[PDB]
């Protein structure tokens, strides 16, 4: 008796981050659209290009609160209660936005996800880890079926969500995302007394009595320098919040510049560049997709929100093949050369419809369909310890503290060249680090 030829712990973490991502996912299909309808009433005062930078900062902030989550839960709080009460906090984010509030609600909703993904994402990934011996083969069989786990949520969620919201409002549909992570806490604690070993109740690697005071130390530093920038920034005029996302872009970036030169190893760069720049590509889909989606397609018969669907569409039926290919045949600086080629065609096709048939009409579904059909594959290069596991957060971060600063160039305006620009700039930058390393 197996979960997919896996131990049936698999299955209690699979559904726990299938139904954390159905919340994350289903969320975040609709709230570019909340934000333009908050700007449409006046509730909200930014352009369409901040909630846009808005969007892509809230998931690099996001992935650098995950950079920072395994930590916490190995040395401090455990893997199990990270898992625990990073769910709670989650399901807290999204009933904020389901209660009857505008713009006022965002940001409280946003922090609370923020630290709860933190927590969550990174350990539920732990503690698949933890189902095997360390010698097992299983473990990337395993690994795999609970990424195809993560991608059955994605898939469903702007569906159901997306539906919802057309049905009975912002409200209502948010509160669904909420239900759907109170369905992934039942599901992981009731399954996880079960399947779990206990031992990751607790650190398992906690912090030895000398670490303390200089981990201290350097927290309080960097959160006391932090606040200083923030006053600065205050008293010369720099409190708008384009202000606020540039700081956390220039922190966000300035990480892995420090966290480099500390090692400073340099064939690691190339690597870690290629990743930065295809997730920032990957992860525009949420927003300037999500944009063309609702502005040059014809989605009156349908909610626009699906389209966020076809991403996790298409790891689903990639996997398959992808799984038969590995067992039936590449180095790992050249998996993310071709993966960094992918999405640079994948944003090099988004430029033909426009300029074919120009940028103030509607043009066929298939183009995003096609252009996402193209990234994920290059997701099929790039997708699937600890330390590394950091360094995966650290580089999504990365890239969406940089669409943070490239997605407000997006319009109707400057579709063709936006698309053209970034989409041959990441062929050629793909070109460029696979012989650079
Ligand atoms: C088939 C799956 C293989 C994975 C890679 C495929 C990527 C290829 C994308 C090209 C398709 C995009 C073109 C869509 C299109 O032009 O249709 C527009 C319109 O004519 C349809 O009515
Ligand atoms: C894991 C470390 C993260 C350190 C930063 C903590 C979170 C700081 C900022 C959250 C990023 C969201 C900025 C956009 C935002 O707040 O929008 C608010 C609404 O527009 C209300 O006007
Ligand atoms: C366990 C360590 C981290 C603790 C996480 C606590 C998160 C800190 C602040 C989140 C702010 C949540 C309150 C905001 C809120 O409720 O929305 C505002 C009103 O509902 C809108 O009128
Ligand atoms: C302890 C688990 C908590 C999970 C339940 C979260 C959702 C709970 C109740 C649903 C709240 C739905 C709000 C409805 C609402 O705001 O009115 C709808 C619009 O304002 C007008 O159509
Ligand atoms: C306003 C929402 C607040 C909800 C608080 C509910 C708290 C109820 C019980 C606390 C249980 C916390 C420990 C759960 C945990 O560590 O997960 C491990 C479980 O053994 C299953 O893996
Ligand atoms: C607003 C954030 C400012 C930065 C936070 C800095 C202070 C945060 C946590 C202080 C933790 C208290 C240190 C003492 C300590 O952890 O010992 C507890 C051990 O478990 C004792 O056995
Ligand atoms: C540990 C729980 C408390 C930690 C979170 C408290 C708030 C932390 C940082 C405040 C936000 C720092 C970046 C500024 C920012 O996001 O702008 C927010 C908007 O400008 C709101 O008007
Ligand atoms: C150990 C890593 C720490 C590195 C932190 C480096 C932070 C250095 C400078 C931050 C300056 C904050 C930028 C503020 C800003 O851009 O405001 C400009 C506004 O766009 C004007 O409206
Ligand atoms: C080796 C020492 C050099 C330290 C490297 C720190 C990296 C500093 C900045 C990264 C560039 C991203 C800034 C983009 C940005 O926020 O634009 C805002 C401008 O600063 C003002 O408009
Ligand atoms: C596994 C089978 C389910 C496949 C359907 C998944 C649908 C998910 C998102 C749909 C997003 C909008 C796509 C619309 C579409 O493909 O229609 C294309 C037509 O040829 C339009 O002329
Ligand atoms: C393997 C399939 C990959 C398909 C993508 C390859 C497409 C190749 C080039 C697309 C770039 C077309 C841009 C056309 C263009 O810039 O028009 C300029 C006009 O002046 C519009 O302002
Ligand atoms: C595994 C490598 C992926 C290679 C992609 C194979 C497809 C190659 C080129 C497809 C280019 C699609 C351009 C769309 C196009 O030209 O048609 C325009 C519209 O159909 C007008 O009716
Ligand atoms: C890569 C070698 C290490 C040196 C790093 C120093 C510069 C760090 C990052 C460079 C990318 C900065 C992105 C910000 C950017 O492009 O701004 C675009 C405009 O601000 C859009 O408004
Ligand atoms: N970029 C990442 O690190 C994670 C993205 C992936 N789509 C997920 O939700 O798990």
């Excluded at 786990?149 to 049905?167: D, H, R, S, T, Y």
């Excluded at 525009?284 to 909610?303: I, K, N």
């Amino acid at each position: 008796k197996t979960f997919f030829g896996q131990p049936l712990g698999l299955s209690t973490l699979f559904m726990t981050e299938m139904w954390e991502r159905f919340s994350y996912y289903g969320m975040r299909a609709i709230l570019l659209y909340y934000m333009w309808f908050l700007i449409s009433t006046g509730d909200l005062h930014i352009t369409r290009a901040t909630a846009a930078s808005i969007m892509a900062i809230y998931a690099s902030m996001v992935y650098l609160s995950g950079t920072i989550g395994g930590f916490v839960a190995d040395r401090i709080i455990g893997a199990r209660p990270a898992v625990f009460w990073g769910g709670v906090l989650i399901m807290l984010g999204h009933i904020v936005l389901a209660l009857p509030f505008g713009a006022s609600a965002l940001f409280g909703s946003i922090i609370l996800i923020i630290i709860g993904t933190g927590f969550l994402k990174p350990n539920v990934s732990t503690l698949v880890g933890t189902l095997y011996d360390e010698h097992d083969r299983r473990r990337d069989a395993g690994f795999s079926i609970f990424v195809f786990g993560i991608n059955l949520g994605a898939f469903i969620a702007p569906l159901i969500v997306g539906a919802a919201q057309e049905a009975a409002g912002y409200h209502v549909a948010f509160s669904l995302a909420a239900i759907g992570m109170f369905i992934g806490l039942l599901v992981y604690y009731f399954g996880g007394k079960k399947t779990l070993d206990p031992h990751y109740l607790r650190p398992t690697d906690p912090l030895a009595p000398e670490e303390v005071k200089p981990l201290l130390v350097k927290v309080s530093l960097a959160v006391a320098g932090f606040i200083a920038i923030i006053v600065v920034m205050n008293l010369v005029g720099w409190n708008s919040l384009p202000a606020y996302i540039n700081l956390l872009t220039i922190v966000a970036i300035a990480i892995p510049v420090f966290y480099f030169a500390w090692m400073i190893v340099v064939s690691y760069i190339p690597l870690f560049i290629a990743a930065v720049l295809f997730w920032a590509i990957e992860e525009q889909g949420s927003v300037v997709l999500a944009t063309f989606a609702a502005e040059r397609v014809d989605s009156s018969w349908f909610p626009v929100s699906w389209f966020q669907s076809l991403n996790p569409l298409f790891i689903m039926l990639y996997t398959p093949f992808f799984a038969w290919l590995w067992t039936a045949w590449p180095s790992s600086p050249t998996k993310f050369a071709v993966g960094l080629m992918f999405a640079g065609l994948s944003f090099l096709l988004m430029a033909i419809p426009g300029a074919l048939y120009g940028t103030s009409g509607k043009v066929s579904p298939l183009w995003l369909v096609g252009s996402w059909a193209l990234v994920i594959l290059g997701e099929m290069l790039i997708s699937p310890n600890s330390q590394m596991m950091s360094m995966w957060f650290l580089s999504s971060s990365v890239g969406s503290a940089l669409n943070a600063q490239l997605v407000t160039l997006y319009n109707a305006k400057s579709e063709v060249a936006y698309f053209s620009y970034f989409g041959l700039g990441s062929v050629v930058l793909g070109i460029v680090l696979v012989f650079l390393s």
